[PDB]
Every structure is written in C-alpha cells, then in structure tokens.
Design an enzyme around this catalytic site. Structure first.
Site, PDB file in Angstrom:
ATOM      1  N   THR A 189      31.584  38.723  45.445  1.00 26.08           N
ATOM      2  CA  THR A 189      30.407  39.035  44.627  1.00 26.08           C
ATOM      3  C   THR A 189      29.071  38.957  45.367  1.00 26.08           C
ATOM      4  O   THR A 189      28.251  39.873  45.247  1.00 26.08           O
ATOM      5  CB  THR A 189      30.343  38.104  43.412  1.00 26.08           C
ATOM      6  OG1 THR A 189      31.648  38.023  42.866  1.00 26.08           O
ATOM      7  CG2 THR A 189      29.471  38.621  42.335  1.00 26.08           C
ATOM      8  N   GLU A 222      37.124  39.569  55.072  1.00 21.13           N
ATOM      9  CA  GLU A 222      37.717  39.322  53.772  1.00 21.13           C
ATOM     10  C   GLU A 222      39.207  39.067  53.957  1.00 21.13           C
ATOM     11  O   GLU A 222      39.907  39.882  54.592  1.00 21.13           O
ATOM     12  CB  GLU A 222      37.469  40.532  52.848  1.00 21.13           C
ATOM     13  CG  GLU A 222      38.281  40.534  51.547  1.00 21.13           C
ATOM     14  CD  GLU A 222      38.151  39.255  50.712  1.00 21.13           C
ATOM     15  OE1 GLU A 222      37.002  38.756  50.476  1.00 21.13           O
ATOM     16  OE2 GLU A 222      39.206  38.734  50.290  1.00 21.13           O
ATOM     17  N   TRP A 269      36.685  30.067  33.885  1.00 18.30           N
ATOM     18  CA  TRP A 269      36.762  30.812  35.136  1.00 18.30           C
ATOM     19  C   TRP A 269      35.379  30.967  35.794  1.00 18.30           C
ATOM     20  O   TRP A 269      35.269  31.643  36.808  1.00 18.30           O
ATOM     21  CB  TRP A 269      37.378  32.223  34.981  1.00 18.30           C
ATOM     22  CG  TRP A 269      38.678  32.402  34.236  1.00 18.30           C
ATOM     23  CD1 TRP A 269      39.906  31.835  34.539  1.00 18.30           C
ATOM     24  CD2 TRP A 269      38.908  33.270  33.110  1.00 18.30           C
ATOM     25  NE1 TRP A 269      40.868  32.289  33.653  1.00 18.30           N
ATOM     26  CE2 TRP A 269      40.283  33.159  32.765  1.00 18.30           C
ATOM     27  CE3 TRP A 269      38.083  34.133  32.350  1.00 18.30           C
ATOM     28  CZ2 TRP A 269      40.853  33.875  31.685  1.00 18.30           C
ATOM     29  CZ3 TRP A 269      38.665  34.860  31.268  1.00 18.30           C
ATOM     30  CH2 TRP A 269      40.042  34.723  30.966  1.00 18.30           C
ATOM     31  N   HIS A 270      34.338  30.380  35.210  1.00 16.23           N
ATOM     32  CA  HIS A 270      32.983  30.451  35.778  1.00 16.23           C
ATOM     33  C   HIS A 270      32.626  29.230  36.646  1.00 16.23           C
ATOM     34  O   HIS A 270      31.477  28.750  36.636  1.00 16.23           O
ATOM     35  CB  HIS A 270      31.968  30.623  34.646  1.00 16.23           C
ATOM     36  CG  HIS A 270      32.131  31.903  33.885  1.00 16.23           C
ATOM     37  ND1 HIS A 270      31.214  32.332  32.952  1.00 16.23           N
ATOM     38  CD2 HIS A 270      33.108  32.847  33.915  1.00 16.23           C
ATOM     39  CE1 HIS A 270      31.626  33.481  32.437  1.00 16.23           C
ATOM     40  NE2 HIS A 270      32.768  33.819  33.009  1.00 16.23           N
ATOM     41  N   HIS A 326      27.414  34.425  31.709  1.00 15.51           N
ATOM     42  CA  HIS A 326      28.262  35.332  32.520  1.00 15.51           C
ATOM     43  C   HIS A 326      27.586  35.620  33.860  1.00 15.51           C
ATOM     44  O   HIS A 326      26.660  36.432  33.944  1.00 15.51           O
ATOM     45  CB  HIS A 326      28.603  36.599  31.747  1.00 15.51           C
ATOM     46  CG  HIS A 326      29.528  36.348  30.598  1.00 15.51           C
ATOM     47  ND1 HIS A 326      29.084  35.891  29.382  1.00 15.51           N
ATOM     48  CD2 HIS A 326      30.875  36.439  30.502  1.00 15.51           C
ATOM     49  CE1 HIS A 326      30.113  35.721  28.576  1.00 15.51           C
ATOM     50  NE2 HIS A 326      31.212  36.064  29.224  1.00 15.51           N
ATOM     51  N   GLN A 337      28.322  36.787  37.079  1.00 20.58           N
ATOM     52  CA  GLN A 337      28.457  37.843  38.117  1.00 20.58           C
ATOM     53  C   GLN A 337      27.130  38.542  38.407  1.00 20.58           C
ATOM     54  O   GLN A 337      26.763  38.701  39.574  1.00 20.58           O
ATOM     55  CB  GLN A 337      29.587  38.858  37.833  1.00 20.58           C
ATOM     56  CG  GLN A 337      29.297  39.970  36.848  1.00 20.58           C
ATOM     57  CD  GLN A 337      30.385  41.041  36.822  1.00 20.58           C
ATOM     58  OE1 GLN A 337      31.080  41.239  37.824  1.00 20.58           O
ATOM     59  NE2 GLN A 337      30.542  41.737  35.679  1.00 20.58           N
TER      60      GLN A 337
HETATM   61  C1  LIG Z   1      39.484  35.941  35.304  1.00 14.24           C
HETATM   62  C2  LIG Z   1      37.950  35.821  35.530  1.00 14.24           C
HETATM   63  C3  LIG Z   1      37.167  36.470  34.580  1.00 14.24           C
HETATM   64  C4  LIG Z   1      35.786  36.400  34.664  1.00 14.24           C
HETATM   65  N1  LIG Z   1      35.016  37.121  33.749  1.00 14.24           N
HETATM   66  C5  LIG Z   1      33.623  37.266  34.055  1.00 14.24           C
HETATM   67  C6  LIG Z   1      32.851  38.201  33.385  1.00 14.24           C
HETATM   68  O1  LIG Z   1      33.374  38.900  32.519  1.00 14.24           O
HETATM   69  N2  LIG Z   1      31.473  38.290  33.649  1.00 14.24           N
HETATM   70  C7  LIG Z   1      30.884  37.453  34.607  1.00 14.24           C
HETATM   71  O2  LIG Z   1      29.695  37.485  34.880  1.00 14.24           O
HETATM   72  N3  LIG Z   1      31.660  36.565  35.312  1.00 14.24           N
HETATM   73  C8  LIG Z   1      33.014  36.478  35.037  1.00 14.24           C
HETATM   74  N4  LIG Z   1      33.744  35.634  35.829  1.00 14.24           N
HETATM   75  C9  LIG Z   1      33.056  34.752  36.831  1.00 14.24           C
HETATM   76  C10 LIG Z   1      32.532  35.517  38.058  1.00 14.24           C
HETATM   77  O3  LIG Z   1      33.397  36.670  38.251  1.00 14.24           O
HETATM   78  C11 LIG Z   1      32.506  34.627  39.343  1.00 14.24           C
HETATM   79  O4  LIG Z   1      31.797  33.403  39.090  1.00 14.24           O
HETATM   80  C12 LIG Z   1      31.899  35.325  40.584  1.00 14.24           C
HETATM   81  O5  LIG Z   1      32.515  36.579  40.743  1.00 14.24           O
HETATM   82  C13 LIG Z   1      32.168  34.527  41.849  1.00 14.24           C
HETATM   83  O6  LIG Z   1      31.543  35.150  42.985  1.00 14.24           O
HETATM   84  P1  LIG Z   1      31.641  34.512  44.468  1.00 14.24           P
HETATM   85  O7  LIG Z   1      30.881  35.446  45.338  1.00 14.24           O
HETATM   86  O8  LIG Z   1      31.297  33.069  44.423  1.00 14.24           O
HETATM   87  O9  LIG Z   1      33.225  34.446  44.755  1.00 14.24           O
HETATM   88  P2  LIG Z   1      34.231  35.679  45.001  1.00 14.24           P
HETATM   89  O10 LIG Z   1      33.633  36.949  44.434  1.00 14.24           O
HETATM   90  O11 LIG Z   1      35.612  35.224  44.650  1.00 14.24           O
HETATM   91  O12 LIG Z   1      34.140  35.809  46.611  1.00 14.24           O
HETATM   92  C14 LIG Z   1      35.010  35.110  47.490  1.00 14.24           C
HETATM   93  C15 LIG Z   1      35.684  36.049  48.499  1.00 14.24           C
HETATM   94  O13 LIG Z   1      35.975  35.175  49.637  1.00 14.24           O
HETATM   95  C16 LIG Z   1      37.327  35.453  50.005  1.00 14.24           C
HETATM   96  N5  LIG Z   1      37.757  34.316  50.840  1.00 14.24           N
HETATM   97  C17 LIG Z   1      38.087  33.084  50.426  1.00 14.24           C
HETATM   98  N6  LIG Z   1      38.407  32.355  51.498  1.00 14.24           N
HETATM   99  C18 LIG Z   1      38.314  33.134  52.596  1.00 14.24           C
HETATM  100  C19 LIG Z   1      38.534  32.943  53.987  1.00 14.24           C
HETATM  101  N7  LIG Z   1      38.928  31.785  54.493  1.00 14.24           N
HETATM  102  N8  LIG Z   1      38.351  33.994  54.813  1.00 14.24           N
HETATM  103  C20 LIG Z   1      37.942  35.195  54.340  1.00 14.24           C
HETATM  104  N9  LIG Z   1      37.733  35.409  53.038  1.00 14.24           N
HETATM  105  C21 LIG Z   1      37.900  34.399  52.159  1.00 14.24           C
HETATM  106  C22 LIG Z   1      38.056  35.599  48.661  1.00 14.24           C
HETATM  107  O14 LIG Z   1      39.345  36.243  48.848  1.00 14.24           O
HETATM  108  C23 LIG Z   1      37.035  36.452  47.882  1.00 14.24           C
HETATM  109  O15 LIG Z   1      37.285  37.828  48.097  1.00 14.24           O
HETATM  110  C24 LIG Z   1      35.161  35.705  35.739  1.00 14.24           C
HETATM  111  C25 LIG Z   1      35.959  35.055  36.685  1.00 14.24           C
HETATM  112  C26 LIG Z   1      37.337  35.116  36.592  1.00 14.24           C
HETATM  113  C27 LIG Z   1      38.074  34.380  37.722  1.00 14.24           C
END
Ligand SMILES: Cc1cc2nc3c(=O)[nH]c(=O)nc-3n(C[C@H](O)[C@H](O)[C@H](O)COP(=O)(O)OP(=O)(O)OC[C@H]3O[C@@H](n4cnc5c(N)ncnc54)[C@H](O)[C@@H]3O)c2cc1C
Ligand SMILES: *[C@@H]1O[C@H](CO)[C@@H](O[C@@H]2O[C@H](CO)[C@@H](O)[C@H](O)[C@H]2NC(C)=O)[C@H](O)[C@H]1NC(C)=O
Ligand SMILES: *[C@@H]1O[C@H](CO)[C@@H](O)[C@H](O)[C@H]1NC(C)=O
Ligand SMILES: *[C@@H]1O[C@H](CO)[C@@H](O)[C@H](O)[C@H]1NC(C)=O
Ligand SMILES: *[C@@H]1O[C@H](CO)[C@@H](O)[C@H](O)[C@H]1NC(C)=O
Ligand SMILES: *[C@@H]1O[C@H](CO)[C@@H](O)[C@H](O)[C@H]1NC(C)=O
Ligand SMILES: *[C@H]1O[C@H](CO)[C@@H](O)[C@H](O)[C@H]1NC(C)=O
EC number: 4.1.2.10
Length: 515
Positions: free
Chosen positions: A35, A54, A455-456, A494, A496
C-alpha cells in the site's frame, strides 16, 4: 477514477528476482511492494533509480484477486506458501491474514476507501503540509477510487443507520466524519478491483525496476551508522545484494508484521532480546516490534427468509466510539479464513448479512517478536492483547447496543424470519446479541467471547519511538520506514486511503530534500 480494466502496463519493468543481478546499485531501495511501497516507489522514480522488492508474485497469477466478486475466494483459498493471502493466528488465538503479492493488502482487501479524520494530523504533532496531503489524496483518487453505484443491501443499512440515530446524513463523501455516508471504493462499478500496483503506472519506466518473488532478509549496515543496502533471496534459493547510491536510502514498507520482523533480523531492536537469539546488535532500540495494535471486530450474522443480493461495503455509520458497516454475502461450504475468529464456526446455508462494529484506537496493544532468528520466511510471533484495556471494552458494549438499535429499525424489519415484536424474529448464524439481557455484563461477555480481527492492525515501528517526524529510523542514516507500522492509532475506520497517500507524500518529501 472511472470504470476501466486493471492496468497491468507496469509489467514491462517487473522482473522475477532470479533474473536480477547478484549485486545491484540504486538511488532508492523500497522493501515491500504494498500500500505505501508502490506509490513511494513510483514517486521517487520520477527523478531517481528505484528498486522495489516484493516477496509475493504478481496479481495476474491469481485472477480472483481482480474482482469485487473474488473477495471471499482469496480468504477461502488454502495457504500453500505462494498464494496472495498468508494465514496466521495471533497468540491471542484469533485467526488473521496478511497479503503476499505485488500491490500488497490492496490486492486482497474489502475495497473501502476513506481519507483520514482531519483531527489526526494535529493529534500526531508532525508538521504535515496539509495542501500537499490533499493533492496527494487527489492523485490516488483519480487513479483508483470511484463513487460507487447503489446496492440494495447497502441502501437498507444506510436507512437503518439514519433511523438508529447515526446522524447526520453526509451523502456521498470520502471524509471520515461522524454520521452516515456512502464512501469511496477501490472496486469499480464494473466489479474490477483497482489497487496500489496500478500506481506503479505513474512511475518512470526507465527509472523503476520491480523485482517480484524477492524475499528481503537483511538490511545491510556500515560499521556514524548508515543503511547501505539489502540482502534478498530468489525463488531458486539464491542470494542477491543491492546497495544505495550517494544520498539515497533504504525504505522499509514491509507492513505492520514484516517491518519489525526485518528490523529485528537486521540487528535493530531490544538489545538483551536480540542478544538472547545470537543476533549482532547494530542499533539498540527498545521499541522495535512494540506497541502493535489490532482494532477488534464484533459482529452479528442475520439469515433473511428471502434471498439478498451480495454487496461490497460502501455505506458507513461513524461515531467517535464505534465505526459500523455491513456486508452481504452468498452462502459457502468453505469458510473464508478469519472472517470468523476460528475454524469451528457454523456454515451459512443461504444468503446472509455480516453486520459489524469496530473499536477505535484501540488502547490495548501487544508485540511482534521473532520466531526464527534467521529465516524471514518463517512468520513472526504476534500478540494483540484484545480487550486488556477497559475503555476498549466499554466502546465495544456501546457499539453492540447500537447494533441492537439497528436491528429494531423499520428499515431492517422485512429481513426478519418471524413477525414478532423483538429482535429474536431474526434468524442468526452464530451468536445473537444477548437475548432479552439488558445490563452491561451480558454485552461484555458477548464482546470478549466473539471478538474477530478487523484486519486494520498497525504499529510496531512507531513515529516517536523508532522514527522521527520524517519517518527516519532514529540513530541511523539513509533508513526510513513507511507503512502501517508507523502509527499507534487508526487514521479513520478504513486506513488504505491514508497509507496510499503516505507512500507518495513521504516520496515527495524525500524529492524536496534532494532539491
Ligand atoms: C482482509 C482485509 C480486508 C481489509 N479491508 C479494508 C478495506 O476495505 N478498506 C481499507 O482501507 N483497509 C482495509 N484493510 C486494511 C488495509 O488494507 C491495510 O491496513 C493496508 O493495506 C496495509 O498497508 P501496508 O503498506 O502497511 O502493508 P501491505 O500493503 O501488506 O504491504 C506489505 C508488502 O510487504 C511485503 N513483504 C513483507 N515482508 C517482506 C520481505 N521480507 N521482503 C519483501 N517483501 C515483503 C508483503 O508481501 C506486502 O506485499 C483490510 C485488510 C485486510 C487484511
Ligand atoms: C468489466 O469487467 C470484466 C470482468 O467481469 C472485465 O473483463 C476482464 O478484463 C480484461 C480485459 O481488459 C481481461 O484480461 C480479463 O480476462 C477479463 N476478466 C474476466 C473475468 O472476464 C472488463 O475488462 C471490465 N470492463 C471494463 C471496461 O473495465
Ligand atoms: C483538505 O481537504 C479537506 C476535505 O477532505 C478540506 O475540508 C480541508 O480544508 C483541506 N485542507 C486544505 C489545507 O486544503
Ligand atoms: C441511487 O441513490 C438513491 C437511492 O439510494 C436515489 O436517489 C437514486 O435514484 C439512485 N440512483 C439510481 C441510478 O438508481
Ligand atoms: C477524529 O479524531 C479525534 C482526535 O483523535 C477524535 O477524538 C474524534 O472522535 C475523531 N472523530 C471521529 C468521528 O471518529
Ligand atoms: C513459533 O510458533 C509456534 C506456534 O506457531 C510456537 O508454539 C513456538 O513457540 C514459536 N517459536 C518461538 C521460538 O517462539
Ligand atoms: C489503557 O487506557 C489508558 C490509555 O492508554 C491507560 O493509561 C491505562 O493504563 C489502560 N487501561 C487499563 C484498564 O489497563
């Protein structure tokens, strides 16, 4: 955004990690293509050479991640180690998921889009450029957010929320505000999922390289300490290294779980803890992996006597103490993992509506610790400590009482199986709201026994504990962290929207410094 197909143009510069050089050199290395990682990557490549790393594959490999209709499917799908959903269980015993795919959790989420609550900026203390925050939201929204069309189930819960007192009516709005509203979605009006991966299309294709199936296992350091590069492995099990150029930086965007994990493995964390595991301490920091939060989900499931159409969540009931939304679904013989907190949960034989409340904050927290002290592909231990704070519990009680009011509305009356006066006229899947029982203790028992994950989850690398106001790891040059691990409280119901905006916002900050 308008209706269009998921845009995969960026694949022209996506490579399997097996095809990358043994030793690379870039201005910027972004670990985790999720994200925040995707728009930060794309943004920095406007001007500099960026490597995005990734661990997952590309979403074309999993077609069910590409449609609104596919949401349950990816959760139902069995975890084999390569699938877009990675299953886990918190040490609390609540089932949960994270993403393992290019685009990250935006490739598997419920598509709900909102901007941060405007009080969030002043609460943090960071000197946010609010004009630029807004322009950055505009950039994300033009690319991947639509005003959703009407869905009958969402329109019922929309009328129910107003009736139950969740006022005022905000109409259509992307802002987190008290009352009832239709909000945005990253599902378009043709059922197509739009996601963070599409924001790569905003990058310069001669500056940005994306490497998939790249498992980043160590941050590399100089002996005035600096991040110098990373070690990653490919699908063949071969090791590759990549280094940053002068004035460039390593950015960790591995998410709430992967960021602390990576930092810990790299020797940045609680000193006596890392020493007990024979990891060489590079930077003592007591808070790496501390203050990790998961907002509880509490819910009821109604089984209507007539069939209801399946819907994606678009309509929200916001109060300061509880954020409410609903989804309606087709029946299934296979449970979508973590929709319900354990596997031993009754299966719906007909359409049902999942009706949900979220606790803000929360105040309860736990930690992320290493399970393997050397292998990044072994999941870390995670504990959330649900409802250890009593303010969390009270807020759950309040939310559950509002759900009772929702079920008493005229708006919800046609979905009762029996035409009696009370809410026992509904048929339920799983536990009903405490039946007849009026006092607070019945709700408290309901809250504690039937809690799910929203999941947040967030935290583990906090601004103020591990990071400064500019997302730099304190005591370490050329290292930042940008993802959901950075804040101790939700920006809105929410998140994202906020984390998409944050990927780009931090990128523009970095580019301004380089000017
Ligand atoms: C089932 C579900 C439903 C949800 N519904 C909503 C919604 O409807 N609306 C909303 O706003 N939010 C929703 N959320 C919450 C929101 O999607 C998340 O809080 C947000 O996407 C997290 O972003 P991030 O960048 O922290 O993590 P992510 O987007 O998970 O980024 C992490 C990336 O790092 C990668 N990674 C991990 N370790 C390594 C490594 N060692 N080497 C290389 N890559 C690695 C992972 O594979 C992943 O691709 C939902 C979450 C889930 C799980
Ligand atoms: C409307 O939705 C359909 C899916 O119901 C989209 O069809 C996909 O789009 C691309 C073509 O650009 C194909 O590669 C996929 O194979 C199609 N998927 C399916 C499930 O058929 C369609 O593109 C959407 N139309 C618009 C204009 O966005
Ligand atoms: C940013 O946008 C919000 C609407 O989301 C608006 O009310 C606010 O005034 C804007 N702030 C600035 C500084 O433009
Ligand atoms: C959609 O929104 C409302 C009912 O929720 C109504 O004003 C309008 O007629 C609907 N539009 C369409 C195209 O059905
Ligand atoms: C917005 O944020 C403030 C400060 O954190 C909080 O007290 C307020 O309740 C929030 N508003 C809503 C509607 O959630
Ligand atoms: C790793 O995980 C399992 C549960 O998945 C747990 O029982 C075990 O104690 C963990 N190992 C360490 C070293 O913490
Ligand atoms: C959690 O709530 C407040 C806010 O952090 C805190 O000071 C207190 O110690 C906690 N409450 C309980 C009941 O443990």
């Amino acid at each position: 955004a308008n209706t269009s197909a998921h845009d995969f143009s960026y694949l022209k510069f996506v490579y399997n990690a097996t095809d990358t050089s043994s030793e690379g050199s870039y201005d910027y290395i972004v670990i985790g293509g999720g994200t925040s990682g995707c728009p930060l990557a794309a943004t920095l490549s406007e001007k500099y050479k960026v490597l995005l790393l990734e661990r997952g594959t590309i979403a074309t490999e999993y077609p069910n991640t590409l449609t609104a209709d596919g949401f349950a499917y990816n959760l139902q799908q069995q975890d084999d180690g390569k699938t877009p959903v990675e299953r886990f269980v918190s040490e609390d015993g609540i089932d949960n998921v994270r993403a393992r795919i290019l685009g990250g959790t935006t490739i598997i989420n419920a598509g709900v889009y909102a901007r941060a609550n405007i009080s969030f900026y002043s609460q943090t203390g960071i000197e946010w450029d609010l004009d630029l925050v807004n322009k950055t939201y505009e950039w994300v929204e033009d690319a991947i957010v639509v005003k959703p069309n009407n869905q009958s189930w969402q329109s019922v819960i929309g009328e129910g929320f107003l009736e139950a007192g969740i006022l005022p009516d905000n109409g259509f709005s992307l802002d987190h505000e008290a009352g009832t509203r239709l909000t945005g979605s990253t599902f378009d009006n043709n059922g197509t999922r739009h996601a963070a991966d599409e924001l790569l299309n905003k990058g310069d294709p001669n500056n940005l390289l994306v490497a998939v199936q790249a498992s980043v296992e160590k941050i590399l350091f100089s002996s005035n300490l600096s991040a110098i590069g990373v070690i990653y492995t490919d699908s063949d099990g071969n090791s590759h290294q990549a280094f940053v150029r002068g004035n460039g930086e390593v950015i960790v965007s591995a998410g709430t779980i992967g960021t602390p994990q990576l930092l810990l493995l790299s020797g940045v964390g609680p000193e006596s803890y890392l020493s007990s595991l024979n990891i060489t301490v590079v930077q003592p920091n007591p808070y790496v992996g501390q203050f990790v939060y998961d907002n509880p989900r509490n819910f009821i499931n109604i089984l209507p006597p007539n069939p209801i159409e399946a819907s994606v969540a678009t309509v929200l009931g916001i109060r300061s103490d509880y954020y409410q939304v609903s989804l309606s679904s087709l029946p299934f013989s296979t449970p979508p993992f973590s929709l319900f907190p354990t596997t031993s949960y009754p299966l719906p034989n007909s359409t049902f509506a999942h009706i949900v409340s979220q606790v803000p904050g929360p105040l309860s927290h736990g930690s992320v610790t290493l399970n393997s002290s050397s292998d990044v592909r072994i999941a870390p231990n995670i504990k959330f400590n649900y409802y250890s704070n009593s303010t969390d519990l009270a807020n759950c009680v309040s939310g559950m009482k509002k759900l009772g009011d929702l079920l008493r509305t005229k708006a919800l009356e046609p979905y009762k199986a029996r035409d009696v006066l009370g809410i026992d006229g509904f048929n339920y899947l799983g536990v009903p709201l405490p039946e007849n029982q009026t006092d607070d203790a019945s709700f408290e028992t309901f809250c504690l026994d039937n809690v799910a994950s929203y999941w947040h989850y967030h935290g583990g690398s906090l601004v103020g504990k591990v990071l400064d106001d500019s997302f730099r790891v304190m005591g370490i040059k050329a290292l930042r962290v940008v993802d959901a691990s950075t804040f101790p409280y939700e920006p809105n119901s929410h998140p994202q929207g906020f984390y998409l905006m944050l990927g780009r916002y931090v990128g523009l900050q970095i580019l301004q410094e380089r000017s």
